[PDB]
Every structure is written in structure tokens, then in C-alpha cells.
């Protein structure tokens, strides 16, 4: 059953690599969007200060 071996590894290797990468890639996108939220907070504070 070469297929069980192909599947046992394909399931794990293709997914752990692609999936964990999406977790951290998006974590950075999300952190940047969170920075945008901070920058909007900053923008709101600056408009009020002016």
C-alpha cells in the first residue's frame, strides 16, 4: 500500500508546512492591520490635539 504511505506523509507534510506558514504569514498581516488600528487611534488623537 504505497498509497497509505503517500497519504500518511502527504497529509502531514503538505498541510503542516502550508498551513503553519499561513498561520504565521497572516499573523504578520494581522499585526500590521492591528498597527493600522493603532495608527487610527493616533490619527484620532492628533486630530483632537490640533
Amino acid at each position: 500500500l504505497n498509497e497509505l504511505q503517500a497519504l500518511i506523509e502527504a497529509h502531514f507534510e503538505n498541510r503542516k508546512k502550508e498551513e503553519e506558514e499561513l498561520v504565521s504569514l497572516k499573523d504578520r498581516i494581522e499585526r500590521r492591520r492591528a498597527e493600522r488600528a493603532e495608527q487610527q487611534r493616533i490619527r484620532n488623537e492628533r486630530e483632537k490635539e490640533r
Binding site: 500500500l1 498509497e3 497509505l4 497519504l7 500518511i8 497529509h11
Partner: peptide, 29 residues
Amino acid sequence: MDAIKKKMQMLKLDKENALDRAEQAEADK
């Protein structure tokens, strides 16, 4: 868990064949 639906069948065949033999071996007298 299709990997083991398939492993199950393989082991099922291995035991069924060993079992077929256990039964025959006893049946043969």
C-alpha cells in the same frame, strides 16, 4: 482516518487468512 480504514482492511485480510488457516488447521484433524 482512511489510512486505517485501509490498514484495517489489510490487517483484516492478514488475520482472516491466518484465521482461515487456524480454522482449516483444526478442521483438517
